[PDB]
Amino acid sequence: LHKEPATLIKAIDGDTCKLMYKGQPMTFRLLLVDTPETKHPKKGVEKYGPEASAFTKKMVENAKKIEVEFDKGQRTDKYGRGLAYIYADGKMVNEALVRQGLAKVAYVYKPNNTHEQHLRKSEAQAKKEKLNIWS
Ligand SMILES: Cc1cn([C@H]2C[C@H](OP(=O)(O)O)[C@@H](COP(=O)(O)O)O2)c(=O)[nH]c1=O
Numbered sequence: 001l002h003k004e005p006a007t008l009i010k011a012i013d014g015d016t017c018k019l020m021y022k023g024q025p026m027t028f029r030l031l032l033v034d035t036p037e038t039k040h041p042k043k044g045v046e047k048y049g050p051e052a053s054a055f056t057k058k059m060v061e062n063a064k065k066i067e068v069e070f071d072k073g074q075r076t077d078k079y080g081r082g083l084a085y086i087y088a089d090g091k092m093v094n095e096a097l098v099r100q101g102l103a104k105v106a107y108v109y110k111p112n113n114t115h116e117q118h119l120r121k122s123e124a125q126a127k128k129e130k131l132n133i134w135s
């Protein structure tokens, strides 16, 4: 897995943001995780959704540099969103959210699961510390 540079265009919510990648604007969806909904009416504004968005927004907006790391499987989903692990100054946003109890490990589709165990151990810690979603 190789990391690549990207430029923040705009954070949309907890697990989705728009980045300029290879000179092209794209919406990215964080791999292996799911932050609560704040958009789709079929779900509504789920508890901790606004919090997860604020965390992600803060994290990506304050970074000196952003990198995207694709897994080994497909790089986009059916909606055309780039599927990656996003890093803000070397810190993985996907793991950060799970560690704070602001996201649950979800959508694990082989072979795009290289970091599954790492995220699972962080989720177990958030759970034991009874953080946010796990409170
Ligand atoms: C994280 C991820 C989501 N998805 C899909 C599954 C869901 O399909 P459906 O929308 O048809 O349920 C949706 C979840 O994303 P959101 O959390 O952004 O809604 O995106 C993938 O296909 N692959 C992925 O790797």
Ligand SMILES: [Ca+2]
Binding pocket: 015, 034, 035, 036, 037
């Ligand atoms: Ca979501």
